[PDB]
């Protein structure tokens, strides 16, 4: 025994057990216990998921389409009050329905008889949810090895996978104790809402936050209801309002989530994401490293021994996909490892040239004697140049094991947001009162003059983003 | 068994060791023996989270409106001067806003003027941003002669207890930092503080949604349209004040539903953020706190553990309705029958189609014959369009280190309405002609009625009932 | 103390022992000997949190563009003038086609009628904006190995691009790190802040407010600057008063940089840090978590490890509060002197205090030099409801704790409420009776006292000025 352990009520820990401390960091150590009678334990595979819920609320209404609604021949202006709150839409949520009346003069029904002008809903596309911060759950894989071949395994957790925190391998045992963290990030959430309807698959989508506030603020806030009032006075027709004004922000507003915004939705089919059917985003990396504490039971003047196999990290080839100002791009790195044990490779970049900068952390992968792993990592570029809107680079991508190290040069391209679309045009007054006239170039960074308009001329929309100065209602006679 | 030395410390020029613990809700006693019944444990601990607040110009206040009519101006220029002076400022520009009018005057001959404004009648509130949480943590350690505590301290990182170190007894214990259980903190995007006297302690947890459109509506223009139809006649100035102009306002500083955040409490006995001390105490551990205890036990002073075990006893279960959108629970009462305290991890181990565990494991330590219980977030999602409900089980485990209990749990599932029975719905099929459709008693399928002829259209006829009518609406023009 | 064997590496296969180091800005001395001296000593002497960000692109963020308007007549029929519209014009709404109005008018030389258009068209663009994304914390350690009194060895770990990485040699020894021990400091909340990127910007892009651009976007595409297009057509505006007062506004407004009390990623002071665009590196004025770290020492068959464990005594020498603003937080700052003759490691923190005042931070611990000073710097919220005083004052406790000796002092601090009303203005409420009283706002500017009751045919009306009179039981144009 290395440290005593007592207790009245367990016969393992009072019989001569020691307390190792291991962290799943993906090392090659191996546990040998020896009582002679070798065995061996190990952690061999981890993962980290992060599991989402979601949250409804009064505040999130649910996303409807809408038609226009209109009826003649009321009797009274309360009749029409009447069927306005009884049959219309309730487009503010209050209980009656909304709209608005309107008068005309009626022989048969004197004075007046009123007409109705209001919206009905067609169909619900989706009810709306916030989506809540993750839980992180790791899993663990411990492996108990007689001789060559694996004898038994115990996969640990904190959420529902494998046995839990605490679980028995052979007559060892292992206690989760918590988790040390890598510094990785995890994704907004607060972008992005859920969409719940039958018609999505698992029957819920990821949308856009702001795409759904928009058709909130027009359908509540009373744009909706101006709609209506445009309609009564003639500026709009019903199938104008129907066709091209009031859907238009529910019907975006039930679209998935872009993959540039938000890390939740797939790019690529390879490609990690929120899986709607079980709440799950399995992290493409580790966020954490889970630490346990193995109780060893291995008799009396029972040792422990640790066998640390190495490697040889050997670059293999490098690759850069074009990084655009305002998303990160990538740099990504095969490595081998050529030497004849495991090994504990640590990727990273470690510089990137003028304009760019790294965003992203290190990378550390269990390497198998002869296998091949990737590593990719985040770069960012920015610049203010005008002269060039493509600009080349390099960054360091280095590896490391725990013996021996390799690095290479990576060339890397950096790609601006343009600042105009080549041969628009600006107009500018300046503190002399006159106006000015600007071509956009063909670079798409910078604008040339173009002339000056006189003291009493403008510079005036010519319509296509062109210019033209002159020294607005015909139907108004 | 490390010697340490110092040239300023008496104790750790001494024979001190250094002991690593860490509170994770264990039975370990660290015993003590000089060269004699003395032993160290950590029994109580607690998670807090600390929020603060941030004003900004952007987070204008919360205040209600009522309109300002005046006339007599005798020129355009005194119009806009009064406005400027006198009228409420909707775009935050530094002058009043408002609409002004000319009328015949034989008086002031051309014209007089009126004018149409707001007022300000009451501040409702000073909004303010949400910051993210500092986490502080409180592990009381006990020191015990036989089965008495003689000394207590409290270790905190935060304000409690005597901070990150502290003297208990002969020994010294030093916070090194804390181990993470990968649980979920509150998100504080999706709400705002809302300051006023009128608000327990000062201030109040509101929607951050309502009062962004409030925002919008008052400083965006739709106020200051509403100016305009007042002066259009549109509107009277007392259906604006009643209806209009004050309803983002008012529901604005309501606050946030139980629903929409953690940080307001949906039982009194749950949870939330005090606005009187900025403190919310977490329902459960979000991290371990890890310690190393200096021991001088003298020349020849060593350690032993003393670890107690115990034997959970599941009692009783429940579960709550599961409503698609909102994640239920699922709750376990577990008993230690054994004779020595112990440590239960609880977790839900599994759950049928249709749901999904979205919580981490517990463990909590429970003592000989004491009770604790459990609770499991489980979220459900369906696409059936044949059952509303949708029954299933789930599995909760509670292990201890040494023995385990499980039991199943039947859930109820609930979907989402997809529509409401008897509602209809249009829809112009691929041959280019319009159909009717109805909702069914289930509330989640439509069924065909009728196609339209050709030259007939689908047309709302007020609660949510179409009909085909010829197409070959203002009355009032 | 600990066998190690491997078939790969003589490092790892002779009688190397593994030692658990935690850079906890402890003075801790890791002192190697060999035998059973050559004293060699490993510390862990300078330390740092970063915070990395990235942005990210969306269809949904649409450019931030000013505008002008565009009027042309002489289109023969409304198919003309639409066609027209949806070719030149700007697309407001995003859907692919220009958006505009028309209006036909009497034409004798193309009857019956001619037509004009109403629309806008795109002047600059004044950025492309981002989400900022949630970082990556990254650490540095620096390690350093002394013979005698002189630093022979160093090398710095992380988990980014700095130093060696994760896994150095340090002498004979290697440095492997672990993972982070996490301290509960809080990170900037991204959520409300945007990027704003051009070249008009330092290095190329800018925090901006996100709720300025959520505005300018609602505006632009929701239907608001189309109905500028009515109005304008109507005769109710101008194009000049549209182009000069009502179309740009929440542009050139959502273009502006965030103001630092919005966001810890924007400074305040111009030596407080934030986010540096040219980077995308906020480096956090205190430590976010303490890496851990296995030390395998290689001290040959009789080496062994030993402790040294400077202390120190801490000595308060001055303190300071800043006025804390109901709704804001505040700071109270202490400044600590090492008074003793060995290095310290103290911790710093906000023990208590008083009514109406809440400690909102955490602890800090400092290593200190003997002889040398650090400050620390805590946050701290008022929040009150009393109807009596707009300031109000208390005190908080500031203490330091060594690891051998404390210290401890009270610091006054002050609090402002957020004014309830302006001294001055009136108010108006409908009594239980409904009938019309009328309040003015006190000189504290936290409560109203009663002025009068109108009349049952009269209202309480608006005066201007924030003034409310009553009047009996408003078109003269009409
Ligand atoms: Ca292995
Ligand atoms: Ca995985
Ligand atoms: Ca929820
Ligand atoms: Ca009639
Ligand atoms: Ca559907
Ligand atoms: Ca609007
Ligand atoms: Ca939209
Ligand atoms: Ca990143
Ligand atoms: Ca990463
Ligand atoms: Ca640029
Ligand atoms: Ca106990
Ligand atoms: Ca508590
Ligand atoms: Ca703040
Ligand atoms: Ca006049
Ligand atoms: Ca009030
Ligand atoms: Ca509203
Ligand atoms: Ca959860
Ligand atoms: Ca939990
Ligand atoms: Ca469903
Ligand atoms: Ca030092
Ligand atoms: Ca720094
Ligand atoms: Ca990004
Ligand atoms: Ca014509
Ligand atoms: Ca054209
Ligand atoms: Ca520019
Ligand atoms: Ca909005
Ligand atoms: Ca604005
Ligand atoms: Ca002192
Ligand atoms: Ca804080
Ligand atoms: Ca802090
Ligand atoms: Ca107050
Ligand atoms: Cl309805
Ligand atoms: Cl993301
Ligand atoms: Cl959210
Ligand atoms: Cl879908
Ligand atoms: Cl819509
Ligand atoms: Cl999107
Ligand atoms: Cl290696
Ligand atoms: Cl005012
Ligand atoms: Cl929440
Ligand atoms: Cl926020
Ligand atoms: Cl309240
Ligand atoms: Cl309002
Ligand atoms: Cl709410
Ligand atoms: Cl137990
Ligand atoms: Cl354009
Ligand atoms: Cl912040
Ligand atoms: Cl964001
Ligand atoms: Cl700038
Ligand atoms: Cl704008
Ligand atoms: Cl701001
Ligand atoms: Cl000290
Ligand atoms: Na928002
Ligand atoms: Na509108
Ligand atoms: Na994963
Ligand atoms: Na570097
Ligand atoms: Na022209
Ligand atoms: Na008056
Ligand atoms: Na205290
Ligand atoms: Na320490
Ligand atoms: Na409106
Ligand atoms: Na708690
Ligand atoms: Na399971
Ligand atoms: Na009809
Ligand atoms: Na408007
Ligand atoms: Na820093």
Redesign the interface.
């Known amino acids: 025994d290395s440290?005593?352990?007592?207790?009245?009520?367990?016969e393992?820990?009072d019989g001569d057990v020691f307390?190792i401390?291991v962290?799943a960091?993906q090392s090659t150590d191996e546990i040998?216990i020896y009582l002679n009678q070798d065995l061996s334990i190990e952690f061999t595979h981890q993962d980290s998921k992060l599991?989402?819920?979601?949250?409804?609320?009064?505040?999130?209404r649910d996303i409807v389409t809408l038609?226009?609604?209109?009826?003649?021949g009321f009797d009274t202006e309360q009749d029409a009050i009447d069927?306005i709150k009884?049959?219309?839409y309730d487009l503010?949520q209050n209980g009656n329905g909304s709209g608005r009346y309107?008068?005309?003069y009626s022989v048969t029904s004197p004075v007046y008889?009123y007409?109705i002008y209001?919206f009905?809903?067609?169909?619900?596309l989706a009810?709306p949810?916030?989506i809540?911060?993750?839980?992180?759950?790791?899993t663990a894989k411990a492996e108990l090895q007689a001789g060559d071949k694996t004898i038994q395994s115990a996969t640990l957790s904190?959420?529902?996978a494998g046995?839990?925190?605490?679980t028995d391998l052979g007559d060892s045992?292992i206690?989760w104790?918590?988790?040390?963290?890598?510094?990785?990030?995890?994704?907004?959430?607060?972008?992005v809402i859920?969409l719940?309807?039958?018609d999505?698959?698992?029957?819920?989508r990821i949308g856009?936050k702001?795409?759904y506030?928009?058709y909130?603020?027009?359908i509540?806030?009373?744009?909706a209801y101006?709609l209506l009032?445009?309609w009564?006075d003639?500026?709009y027709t019903?199938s104008e309002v129907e066709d091209e004004?009031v859907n238009?922000?529910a019907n975006q507003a039930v679209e998935e989530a872009?993959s540039?915004?938000?890390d939740l939705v797939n790019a690529k089919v390879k490609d990690s994401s929120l899986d709607?059917?079980?709440?799950?985003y399995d992290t493409p990396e580790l966020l954490?490293?889970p630490?346990f504490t193995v109780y060893v039971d291995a008799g009396e003047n029972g040792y422990?021994?640790?066998?640390?196999?190495?490697?040889d990290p050997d670059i293999i080839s490098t690759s850069s996909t074009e990084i655009?100002?305002?998303?990160?791009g990538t740099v990504c790195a095969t490595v081998e490892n050529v030497?004849?044990?495991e090994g504990e490779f640590?990727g990273?970049?470690?510089?990137?040239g003028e304009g760019f900068?790294?965003?992203?952390?290190?990378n550390?992968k269990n390497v198998g004697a002869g296998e091949s792993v990737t590593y990719s990592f985040?770069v960012?570029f920015?610049?203010?140049?005008?002269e060039s809107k493509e600009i080349s680079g390099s960054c360091t991508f280095?590896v490391?094991?725990?013996?021996s190290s390799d690095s290479t040069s990576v060339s890397v391209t950096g790609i601006?947001?343009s600042?105009?679309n080549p041969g628009?045009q600006?107009?500018e007054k300046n503190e002399n009162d006159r106006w000015e006239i600007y071509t956009c170039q063909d670079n798409g960074?910078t604008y040339e003059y173009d002339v000056t308009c006189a003291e009493d001329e403008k510079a005036v929309?010519?319509?296509?983003?062109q210019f033209s100065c002159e020294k607005?209602?015909?139907?108004?006679?």
């Open positions: 440290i005593t352990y007592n207790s009245g009520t367990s393992f820990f307390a401390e962290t960091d040998d599991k989402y819920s979601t949250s409804t609320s009064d505040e999130l038609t226009t609604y209109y009826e003649d069927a009884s049959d219309c503010n309107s008068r005309y008889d007409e209001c009905q809903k067609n169909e619900k009810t949810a916030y809540d911060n993750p839980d992180e759950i790791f904190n959420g529902d046995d839990g925190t605490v045992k206690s104790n918590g988790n040390l963290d890598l510094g990785a990030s995890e994704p907004e959430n607060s972008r859920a719940y309807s039958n999505f698959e698992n029957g819920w856009n702001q795409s506030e928009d909130k603020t027009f509540g806030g009373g744009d101006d009032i445009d009564q003639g500026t019903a004004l238009t922000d872009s540039s915004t938000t709607t059917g079980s709440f799950v954490s490293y630490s422990i021994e640790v066998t640390k196999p190495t490697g655009k100002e305002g998303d990160e030497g004849d044990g640590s990273r970049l470690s510089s990137c900068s790294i965003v992203d952390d290190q550390t985040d960012a920015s610049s203010v140049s005008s280095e490391n094991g725990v013996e601006q947001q600042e105009c628009d600006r107009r960074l929309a010519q319509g296509d983003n607005e209602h015909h139907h108004h006679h």
